[PDB]
């Protein structure tokens, strides 16, 4: 078979690959380059002080263990292989109850490049808290945050970065705007630190 060689390459990738350890445990810091494509800004439920957003949250990082050589320069793998290897545990700090869409199957993909760079795109629907000061109601304005970061790994272990410059990393689709009574003027992208009880973590935010 022509393509059987590719299977062998896959069978050679996971040989000895311990998924429990991050790419650089005790040697480096696993830099993660992340960015969002807001496919649709969902309705803002002022009753719950909550809003909804549907995003193609996509991340990338370098894992030297998965370096290979073969015919194609990029391997586009199924969602199962993502579960088979290490991936970041990014979550949303202000999120309430989101769902990763899996219709018809998990909306995930993995692209392993020859140099070891990965690309793990998702399709999330995050409904997150948007605190409000309704002193000027109905003539008020809000800044709903979307703050995300690693759950387990501190600053010394995992650090997040924006792929492009911060302003142009987060992109909102023009046709996608489900807001009824609100108007989306724009977004501001930033990064910062949170010092929790366990340790210090990087939190990447979009207001």
């Amino acid at each position, epitope marked *: 078979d022509n393509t059987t060689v590719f299977t062998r390459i896959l069978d050679r990738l996971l040989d000895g690959y311990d998924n429990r350890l991050r790419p650089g445990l005790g040697e480096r810091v696993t830099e993660v380059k992340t960015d969002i494509f807001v496919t649709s800004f969902g309705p803002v439920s002022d009753h719950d002080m909550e809003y909804t957003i549907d995003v193609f949250f996509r991340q990338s990082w370098k894992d030297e263990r998965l370096k290979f050589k073969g015919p194609m320069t990029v391997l586009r793998l199924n969602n199962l292989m993502a579960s088979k290897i290490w991936t970041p545990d990014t979550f949303f*700090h*202000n999120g309430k109850k989101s769902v990763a869409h899996n219709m018809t199957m998990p909306n995930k993909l993995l692209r392993i490049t020859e140099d070891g760079t990965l690309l793990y795109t998702m399709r999330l629907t995050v409904r997150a808290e948007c*605190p409000m*000061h309704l002193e000027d109601f109905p003539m008020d*304005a*809000h*800044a709903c*945050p979307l*703050k995300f970061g690693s759950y387990a790994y501190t600053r010394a272990e995992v650090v997040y970065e924006w792929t492009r410059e911060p302003a142009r990393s987060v992109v909102v689709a023009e046709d996608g705007s489900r807001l009824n009574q609100y108007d989306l*003027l*724009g977004q*501001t992208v*930033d*990064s*910062g*630190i*949170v*010092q*929790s009880s366990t340790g210090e973590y990087v*939190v990447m*935010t979009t*207001h």
Partner: nanobody
Amino acid sequence: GSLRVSCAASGRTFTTYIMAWFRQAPGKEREFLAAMDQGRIQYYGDSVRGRFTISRDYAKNSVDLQLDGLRPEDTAVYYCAAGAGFWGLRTASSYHYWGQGTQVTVSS
């Protein structure tokens, strides 16, 4: 040298507001220094990343700034500000409350 600049709010609970510090060197150019959210998340300016540390005390409704590694160019008036970040979080236009300001001078 090391210093600590405190700011206490009275007349309103700023638990849900974003509390920040700003700098004004002589020359009329307000510079962002640090800011802290309801979620304890700290943002900093690139000039003072890791030199100054911002903190908040929500029970006492105050914001503190611990300054380390003061250099002679850091002489300036430091202002304490609060307000939700609308079109901002790094711009003075988004803050509707400001402190009287405190002069700080560094002499070698």
